[PDB]
Amino acid sequence: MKQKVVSIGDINVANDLPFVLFGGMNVLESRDLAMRICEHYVTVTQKLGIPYVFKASFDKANRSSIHSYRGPGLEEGMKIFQELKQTFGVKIITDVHEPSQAQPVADVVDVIQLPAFLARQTDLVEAMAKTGAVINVKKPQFVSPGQMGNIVDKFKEGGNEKVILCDRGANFGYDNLVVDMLGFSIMKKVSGNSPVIFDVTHALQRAQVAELARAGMAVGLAGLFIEAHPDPEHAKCDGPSALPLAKLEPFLKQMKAIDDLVKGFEELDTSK
Template sequence: MVEAVTIGGVGFGGVNRLALIGGPCVIESEAHALSLAERIKTIASRQNVPLVFKASFDKANRTSLQSFRGPGIDEGLRILDRVKHELGLPILTDIHEATQAAPVAEVADALQIPAFLSRQTDLLVAAARTGRPVNLKKGQFLAPQ
């Protein structure tokens, strides 16, 4: 059986029922994040499915330097904090550097490690030390064990 994990009161694994992690790939604007979070919350509530809102403040792995990366950590965390407190949703967001772990954990209920960073030991240790659940996106280059 899969060990249960709780993210902001939403249970995953074990005997917990289906739950949803959803949101935009990256925060485009405060208005967009709040509007989308509210819409997803309404849909999830209608289906009686618990929701964790996921959005990134920085997509540091874009293929083009001209691609939009997001609002950055300070503005992004401010927006995610509004989503959390105004809509009552738990928050999951990516971190890309070990120095981001502690400040992100002050807002986010769980931290996510992007697949391409899944072997960065210092990043993984920093995320674990926050005490928050860590969603490790497994790179295709890693063995299934």
């Protein structure tokens, strides 16, 4: 059984291919920051030899208080990815929230993204189904790994057949998430074997980002989604749990050593 490949330009994402990193930051605070962050990634990846798709959000739909930092905005956010593309030559992956934002961003960026909270939103999906651009469905925390068929189906119909599934853990009691390492295969299966990626930073609402990233990779994955910040501490807020830039490399060496050791194993059948 072969894996479905979903190519993002020259990059080919797929469950049996070496993992692709969809690194980056959470929100686009300031280009001086984006630029620095994305600068460090590019360098680290390039050096270690890892495909990459810088990720960042230009909009914040579910923030605290109305009087909060919405975000650059779609019209000002998009202009930033512009500069980063030229200056660095990397792919941009961003999340849309309203059915109208679909097409605009589709041009500007390589891989768009569907938020879990909305995963189940026909109008927004169909609008993304149009564009035809690479789709990344974030697996909602309140949905089992085997329900990811209808989501991919609802995209096939929309004329879009380039989809990646992102897992970020599941609810474990109140205010808590646990990642089911068995959920990754159950997702490959029901999705025609589409690419499955692990959003480690977002599955961790710590000095834990590593042990948890190793377990994910050892399973064998198409990719890995993560976020980092120059100063996690002071800047700490809530939602995800960013990785410390200065640790990117020794952390990515961890993955490769795993993603390679495992990515080249003789198929095993514990089934019989």
